[PDB]
Ligand binder design. Structure first.
Ligand SMILES: [Zn+2]
Ligand SMILES: [Zn+2]
Lengths: 382, 382
């Protein structure tokens, strides 16, 4: 276990600083040159690492990142650098004879069969899905569009099946980790990342650490009830924030409001977050009102979170950030009016660096597993 | 450094779950039989540990536990078990000639001079107080009752003056750790402890770690907005929890509504929190209304915190715990109504085991330093 951390800490460095020397790794990782020698030599003998100084070897090593969303599975074969080999997306019908679990395995098998020739060593699967997720054990408790899913052993069934580690994460936590490693929150101690998407929620980084990291519970603010009379949520409650502020719910609402309007510009195109944001940025009062509304709800909850966590940055990750110039000040205003001035004083509401499209976040699951060394040791089996 | 972590882990499992043999510790603390003999022996030598299995030897190992409050200082001499040896309190006037740091040091000096024959080995001094605290450097940045406190190096100075380690912490943080160690939350790796007195605060442990351990910030629930039409808070915003749940506001409101409700039992006695709670339990409509009122406000925040943190235990530390039969069900019901079913399902809202009068909390600071092995390393110094 001590071995596990050390290897990962040294891999991290090679990854981040390579070309880098054995001598340098020694001081930076605070580890005896002898330990560094040992760790590095295992890495060389596995082709996890190459010489020139030390550097990572990424081509020979692949992973699958899956993403699941409403009626769709995305699959991507990628290098450990995260470079894409092949990408597919497929129908995942919402209702079917077969359990979702199988249908999933089925899609994966088809992928390997199809692109079997592009495959180098498969190291792991990174999965990113909506729902209520035990990322420790890879259990999907409940999830949004496939009503059929209850305590689904996604992680275990897939490890059993592929013989490879399965890293499963919620979309939001995955994204938070991506922004932490590669994004807008690198080397930040205290961040709250809010995501307004098909999901509503947040990841938190406190004292430099991802809250709940590698535990079986997540930050689950999207399921704090805001309407005691609202629509049923897949969590098993009703009126959850996600019910009101998810992108899909905003758009259902806009549609209903649009139906009573004959004045709105949103009548010009099919209704999409993009047209929503486009219209609001022009001063369409309906569109603006809608975005303002979401602002108020998210602001409110974010304000509570500010009082508890005292973050340095707030990252909004969302299609609505197209309308940053309406959305962000509303969030800002809530936080200023609703959190301790001393905590709320010099807080920037800023957008996320990434838009989290496709399977891009999977890289954060893998690098994370390399860095904490868990995947690393599994790899050093050979 | 590397030796520390283990030594702390080792003392920890001997402390709670002793007597326990070498080999039983080998598997529990995950260190080789050879490493488990080494650490224990040093412990047998310095007498930190005794044989029978291995028991903690504590009677002849003292620390000074300090508590600063409104114009007052509590000093108490304690067993490493936390067993009281002697306990005194002094005047600490809000304004004086000799700076506060002096008068404090001066007080401690006098304590030792006084209780000399009862002293054994002084291991450390634990200090507990309100204010903003550099828990790391023992710097008191600011603190409520002594406006003259700015950047006070309480830690540095007392160590320099006494030569013993000096652990400083905020009331609520110390209390939160004290309930997890000796109190109502023993066993939980995850706890929200809400404190409702003249101030509203909270401590949160997730994964056996104090939230904000790595900074000077507090879980400032007191300032979360519970009422967008409420009254101004000293923070500047409106409708802060504290505005309504602080014992003071509660009595303020009771006083207001009592003034018209000449049915209130609350007319026979002067208006104390206790008479209020006594009357709520006797089913007085106003008292019960007011207590319920406070409950639903706190309940709402706690619902959000549950979704944030997923604790196993919620502890209320308050005079209002006298109304637990009323306050707690209302809080429980909020959580159940408002938070993620998975998280709301088996959660206990129970009362804090201690009221944190005096110094029963310092104890946690020392125990912690004994468990991370920092004090332990110091104590194997000689
Ligand atoms: Zn929900
Ligand atoms: Zn306030």
């Amino acid at each position: 276990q001590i071995k596990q951390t050390n290897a990962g800490a040294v891999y991290r460095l090679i990854d981040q600083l390579g070309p880098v020397s054995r001598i340098d790794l020694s001081r930076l990782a605070q580890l005896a040159p002898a330990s560094i020698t040992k760790i590095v030599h295992e890495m060389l003998e596995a082709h996890l690492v190459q010489e020139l100084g030390l550097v990572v070897e990424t081509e020979a090593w692949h992973y699958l990142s899956l993403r699941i969303s409403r009626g769709e599975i995305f699959l991507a074969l990628r290098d450990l650098s995260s470079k894409l080999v092949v990408e597919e997306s497929q129908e995942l019908a919402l209702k079917d004879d077969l359990p979702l679990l199988d249908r999933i395995i089925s899609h994966i098998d088809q992928f390997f069969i199809r692109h079997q020739k592009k495959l180098e060593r498969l190291t792991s699967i990174a999965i990113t899905l909506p729902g209520i997720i035990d990322t420790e054990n890879g259990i999907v408790h409940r999830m949004p569009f496939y009503e059929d899913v209850k305590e689904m052993p996604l992680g275990e069934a897939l490890e059993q099946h592929t013989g490879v580690p399965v890293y499963i994460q919620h979309d939001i936590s995955a994204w938070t980790m991506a922004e932490a490693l590669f994004g807008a929150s690198r080397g930040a101690r205290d961040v709250i990342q809010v995501v307004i998407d098909h999901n509503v929620g947040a990841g938190v980084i406190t004292d430099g650490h991802l809250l709940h990291a590698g535990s079986s519970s997540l930050v689950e603010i999207g399921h704090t009830q805001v309407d005691p009379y609202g629509k049923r949520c897949y969590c098993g409650n009703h009126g959850c924030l996600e019910t009101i502020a998810s992108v899909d719910s905003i758009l259902e609402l806009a549609q209903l409001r649009l139906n009573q309007s004959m004045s709105s510009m949103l009548h010009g195109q099919p209704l999409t977050v993009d047209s929503l944001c486009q219209a609001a940025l022009r001063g369409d009062l309906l569109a603006k009102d809608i975005i303002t509304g979401v602002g108020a709800h998210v602001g409110r909850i974010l304000a509570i979170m500010v009082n508890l966590f005292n973050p340095q940055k707030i990252l909004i990750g969302s299609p609505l950030s197209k309308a940053a110039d309406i959305l962000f000040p509303v969030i800002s205003d809530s936080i200023r009016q609703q959190a301790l001035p001393a905590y709320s004083q010099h807080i920037s509401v800023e957008s996320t660096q990434f838009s989290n499209q496709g399977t891009m976040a999977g890289a954060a699951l893998v690098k994370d597993a390399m860095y904490n060394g868990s995947l690393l040791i599994r790899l050093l089996q050979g």
